Amino acid sequence: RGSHMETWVLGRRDVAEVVAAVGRDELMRRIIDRLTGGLAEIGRGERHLSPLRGGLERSEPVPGIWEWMPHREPGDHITLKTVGYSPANPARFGLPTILGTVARYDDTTGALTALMDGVLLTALRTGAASAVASRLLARPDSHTLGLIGTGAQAVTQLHALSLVLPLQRALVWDTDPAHRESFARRAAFTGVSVEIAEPARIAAEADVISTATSVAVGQGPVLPDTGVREHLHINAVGADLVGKTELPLGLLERAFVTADHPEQALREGECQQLSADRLGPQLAHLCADPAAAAGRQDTLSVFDSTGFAFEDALAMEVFLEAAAERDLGIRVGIEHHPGDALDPYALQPLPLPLAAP
Amino acid sequence: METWVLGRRDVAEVVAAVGRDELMRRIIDRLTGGLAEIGRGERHLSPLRGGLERSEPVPGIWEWMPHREPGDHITLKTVGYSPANPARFGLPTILGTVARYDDTTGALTALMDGVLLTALRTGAASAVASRLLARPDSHTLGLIGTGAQAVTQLHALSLVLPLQRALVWDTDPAHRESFARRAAFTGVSVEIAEPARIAAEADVISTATSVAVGQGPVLPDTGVREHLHINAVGADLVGKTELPLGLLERAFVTADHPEQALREGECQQLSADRLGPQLAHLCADPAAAAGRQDTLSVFDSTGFAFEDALAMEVFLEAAAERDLGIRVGIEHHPGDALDPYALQPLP
Numbered sequence A: 001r002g003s004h005m006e007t008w009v010l011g012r013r014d015v016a017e018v019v020a021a022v023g024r025d026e027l028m029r030r031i032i033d034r035l036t037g038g039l040a041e042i043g044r045g046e047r048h049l050s051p052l053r054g055g056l057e058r059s060e061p062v063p064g065i066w067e068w069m070p071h072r073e074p075g076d077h078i079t080l081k082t083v084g085y086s087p088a089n090p091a092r093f094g095l096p097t098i099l100g101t102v103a104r105y106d107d108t109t110g111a112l113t114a115l116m117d118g119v120l121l122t123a124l125r126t127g128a129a130s131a132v133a134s135r136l137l138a139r140p141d142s143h144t145l146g147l148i149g150t151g152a153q154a155v156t157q158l159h160a161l162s163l164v165l166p167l168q169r170a171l172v173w174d175t176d177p178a179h180r181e182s183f184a185r186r187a188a189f190t191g192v193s194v195e196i197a198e199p200a201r202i203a204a205e206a207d208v209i210s211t212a213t214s215v216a217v218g219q220g221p222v223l224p225d226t227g228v229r230e231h232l233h234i235n236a237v238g239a240d241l242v243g244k245t246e247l248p249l250g251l252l253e254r255a256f257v258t259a260d261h262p263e264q265a266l267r268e269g270e271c272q273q274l275s276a277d278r279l280g281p282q283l284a285h286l287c288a289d290p291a292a293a294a295g296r297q298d299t300l301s302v303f304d305s306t307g308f309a310f311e312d313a314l315a316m317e318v319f320l321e322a323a324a325e326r327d328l329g330i331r332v333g334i335e336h337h338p339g340d341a342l343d344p345y346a347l348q349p350l351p352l353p354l355a356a357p
Numbered sequence B: 001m002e003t004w005v006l007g008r009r010d011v012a013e014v015v016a017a018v019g020r021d022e023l024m025r026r027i028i029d030r031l032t033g034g035l036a037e038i039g040r041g042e043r044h045l046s047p048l049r050g051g052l053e054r055s056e057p058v059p060g061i062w063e064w065m066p067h068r069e070p071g072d073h074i075t076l077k078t079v080g081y082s083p084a085n086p087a088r089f090g091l092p093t094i095l096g097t098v099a100r101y102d103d104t105t106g107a108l109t110a111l112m113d114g115v116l117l118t119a120l121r122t123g124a125a126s127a128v129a130s131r132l133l134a135r136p137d138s139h140t141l142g143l144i145g146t147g148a149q150a151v152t153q154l155h156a157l158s159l160v161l162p163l164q165r166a167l168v169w170d171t172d173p174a175h176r177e178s179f180a181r182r183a184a185f186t187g188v189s190v191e192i193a194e195p196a197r198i199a200a201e202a203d204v205i206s207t208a209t210s211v212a213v214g215q216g217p218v219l220p221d222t223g224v225r226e227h228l229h230i231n232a233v234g235a236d237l238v239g240k241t242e243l244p245l246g247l248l249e250r251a252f253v254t255a256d257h258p259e260q261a262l263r264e265g266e267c268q269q270l271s272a273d274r275l276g277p278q279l280a281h282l283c284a285d286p287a288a289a290a291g292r293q294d295t296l297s298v299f300d301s302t303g304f305a306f307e308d309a310l311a312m313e314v315f316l317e318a319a320a321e322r323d324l325g326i327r328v329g330i331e332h333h334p335g336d337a338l339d340p341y342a343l344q345p346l347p
């Protein structure tokens, strides 16, 4: 742990190479497996939920939030995801709405040991979480997926869920016609047929639904309370600003609701709409004991998804394992570790030339 | 767009090209101007920092410190306090990094060392406060704690006050005995002296210790020169203080960040209504300080992220001028913003 040590940086090209080498399906399966196992450890009391995430809300050019998401594994390392939600990014800047990075700090010394992209990782672990929850709460013969919001998360929602359920078709809606019209192309690699459908038809026909929209505060719901199939399972994934919800209260009030992180869901999930005592067991509890969801595949269920840093730490480990196996990334001395630990000015600039000019 | 990364080597090169005094002055100047802007209501204090307490190896904390300049950028310092680092690992107790994110898009635009930058802006803040609240003819500086921050407390204060000597103490004999050579570059003579003597002879003191919660105080509850000014710089865990209560309770106290001070500063010992005007208020109206040079004063320093934003800008200006640093594509920006898998080209 001496001063010599440096930070392992995985850039955009290294993350691409992991995907190419491992393959999209297998990478996602790995992340599903890792999350499943980690959530079960939480459910058994072996590990703790992450502290509540925090952020700085920004009103322009459309309201969004930039957040910090710490998770400590005592004695090992601290993970921090720094992540923005800026829902004008695609149309104004050609950038994703969700832009972030994930860092690892040594628990013992506090040294920054690794840093990587958070955009891909976030999309993957968020799809994976919906898959963990849906494998438990959706009918195992579910064939039709509904998606409300067909932006970036929708892509990994469909992908992840196609890996745990025998999906054959997706019925999809977005309030931006261009975004719903491009979804078939973005979704084609999954082999799942895509059709555009209005929310009322999605509600009526889907076996499982994911909502993942940039709906503004107080502008929900995004799925009307219009008649749904009895066994419907919904992943409510949209999460950013306090005040943002996507599901109608009438539906939520008659569902079995599992939150990823109950205290956080009550603040910024659909559980904003509910009292604490109406919540079913949390996702970690279901992972430790799937029968705590007994019977809930045949009745209305909702997985309230907010995202928490433990999920990022687990996904990051999957990337760092595959990247280490292929020798990827670079090492950069970012942090100053002075030769004399008590002398901040003990720096080492490049030596000066000796020869006469 | 890619992230501009300034590592230890680039930071060393800034110091070598600009020089230590000049770099410190720039930071003093930027902070003085920034704090005065806060004091006029043109800018605002950072939100309260947060952290994760760590019990081992000895109690420490790893913290996150955000600051937003709306429409411009967001700064985040991530910083550990791990006071076994020097002796166990040869690492500084304070280890961190500073990142900048575009406010509009969220994108990570710059990343740099936080170790040097922390020590500089922390010295600078004491200099800002001391120029206001110490006697202008102050000749004797006292330092309690002679580790990393002491070096920049001395340097910064030597630039703003006519200091002739530093009386110093550390509970680790090796740490006090090495201080004269770490300080030599400042031209201020160093003498090792016990806390009772430092308390009684200093014109200005900075306390900057890794004292544990429940340990200390680091000066005795004694009589002091009437005009004594103290910078209380140690700050880490909730619970941690350095000064005796009887000294604090008869001082005029200014905090860098009053809410933060009340939680993790000397002001943890005081009720909220005993804090006086904050540092930014004095910076915008130096006349409010001028009567308090001749009676006991304390600057309660915790550090806040605005200071890190300002110091980082100084470094980025100097680095751009010499085109230092590298560019790394860290964040994935997919060719289609709505397609996370659009990673093309595959390697």
Ligand SMILES: NC(=O)c1ccc[n+]([C@@H]2O[C@H](COP(=O)([O-])OP(=O)(O)OC[C@H]3O[C@@H](n4cnc5c(N)ncnc54)[C@H](O)[C@@H]3O)[C@@H](O)[C@H]2O)c1
Residues within 6 Å of the ligand: A085, A087, A090, A097, A098, A122, A123, A126, A148, A149, A150, A151, A152, A153, A154, A173, A174, A175, A176, A179, A212, A213, A214, A215, A216, A221, A222, A236, A237, A238, A239, A240, A305, A306, A307, A308, B337, B338
């Ligand atoms: N739960 C988690 O772990 C997690 C993680 C990542 C992102 N998120 C959240 O998922 C949501 C979507 O993120 P993204 O990366 O897909 O954003 P995106 O901008 O790529 O896609 C969101 C889409 O929602 C559409 N939309 C807005 N209002 C709508 C409405 N009323 N009905 C239908 N569609 C609507 C937009 O037109 C856009 O296509 C955000 O709230 C984001 O913060 C959650």
Ligand SMILES: NC(=O)c1ccc[n+]([C@@H]2O[C@H](COP(=O)([O-])OP(=O)(O)OC[C@H]3O[C@@H](n4cnc5c(N)ncnc54)[C@H](O)[C@@H]3O)[C@@H](O)[C@H]2O)c1
Residues within 6 Å of the ligand: A341, A342, B081, B083, B086, B093, B094, B118, B122, B144, B145, B146, B147, B148, B149, B150, B169, B170, B171, B172, B175, B208, B209, B210, B211, B212, B215, B216, B217, B218, B232, B233, B234, B235, B236, B301, B302, B303, B304
């Ligand atoms: N802005 C701020 O106010 C700010 C910024 C950086 C660091 N700090 C804080 O300043 C303190 C010191 O940081 P550092 O980087 O110099 O750490 P360091 O470990 O380099 O030096 C601390 C020194 O304090 C000494 N010490 C411990 N207990 C003492 C006692 N009772 N009396 C005298 N000396 C004692 C130690 O032996 C050590 O040499 C920490 O609390 C740190 O978190 C505050």
Ligand SMILES: N[C@@H](CCCC[NH3+])C(=O)O
Residues within 6 Å of the ligand: A053, A054, A055, A056, A057, A065, A239, A240, A241, A242, A268
């Ligand atoms: N400003 C709020 C945001 C909470 C997180 C919202 N997803 C906070 O820091 O507490």
Ligand SMILES: N[C@@H](CCCC[NH3+])C(=O)O
Residues within 6 Å of the ligand: B049, B050, B051, B052, B053, B061, B063, B235, B236, B237, B238, B264
């Ligand atoms: N655990 C506390 C620590 C505050 C920072 C102390 N200097 C928090 O997150 O609020």
